[PDB]
């Protein structure tokens, strides 16, 4: 086509979606990870995760307001990944890299799994 | 912080949100423009437009499944802007620039208004 493109548009959209999340505006699901609860937008979860994409395209699960993750999933690893989904920023540290990689493999977040594998290989 | 960043994450999120829109997955509102109807995600509309941001943060309007725009709004201008919201790509042409600018001013999409003003000034 003959379209023009606004370079910062996608980043600005994600920044505003994160502002809505921080204010709990139009969040439509709670993700339960052990004792911890995380509110989010189903569409953002689907856009970032192969697991959530599969869950919310399911004709029955698409209507659930509560999703319980596998008890092996670490709440901190999930929190770091949820923050990444809404910001593009990953808080990857020596003390959390194993929990982050395991959570990203479960959530099917291929690019996060790839950087964790590379950072582990370096050490 | 000590975060790492995935450059393409925001663009990949927006691409997936547009895939959900094209398949009518988790769309939660219909925007009526004269005879024409457009299905969308309230969160994406809010992230892109000052008008939708104001509408869906309103304690009563946040619950509406149908929003009717002012009858002066042109459906083609709205369609071009809705496509821009989900792609960062604006189909700006000599034949649509006046309708696009008027719709962007109404929707409060400041960056679109700015490029329309510049393109009109050049001609």
């Amino acid at each position: 086509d003959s379209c023009i493109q606004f370079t910062r548009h996608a980043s600005d959209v994600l920044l505003n979606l994160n502002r809505l999340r921080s204010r709990d505006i139009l969040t439509d699901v709670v993700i339960v990870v052990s004792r911890e609860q995380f509110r989010a937008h189903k569409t953002v979860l689907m856009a970032c995760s192969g697991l959530f994409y599969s869950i919310f395209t399911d004709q029955l699960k698409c209507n659930l307001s509560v999703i319980n993750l596998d008890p092996e999933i670490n709440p901190e690893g999930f929190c770091i990944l949820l923050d990444f989904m809404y910001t593009s920023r990953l808080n990857l540290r020596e003390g959390n890299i194993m929990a982050v990689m395991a959570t990203a493999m479960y959530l099917q977040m291929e690019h996060v799994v790839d950087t964790c594998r590379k950072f582990i290989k370096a050490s | 912080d000590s975060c790492i960043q995935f450059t393409r994450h925001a663009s990949d999120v927006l691409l997936n949100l547009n895939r959900l829109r094209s398949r009518d997955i988790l769309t939660d509102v219909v925007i009526v423009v004269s005879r024409e109807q457009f299905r969308a995600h309230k969160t994406v509309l809010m992230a892109c437009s000052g008008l939708f941001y104001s509408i869906f943060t309103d304690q009563l309007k946040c619950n509406l499944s149908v929003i009717n725009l002012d009858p002066e709004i042109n459906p083609e201008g709205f369609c071009i802007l809705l496509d821009f919201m989900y792609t960062s790509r604006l189909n700006l042409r000599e034949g649509n620039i006046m309708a696009v600018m008027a719709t962007a001013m109404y929707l409060q999409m400041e960056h679109v208004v700015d490029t329309c003003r510049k393109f009109i000034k050049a001609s």
């Binding site: 379209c3 023009i4 493109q5 606004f6 370079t7 | 790509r89």
Partner: peptide, 4 residues
């Protein structure tokens, strides 16, 4: 704005 750019030409994509």
């Amino acid at each position: 704005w750019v030409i994509p």
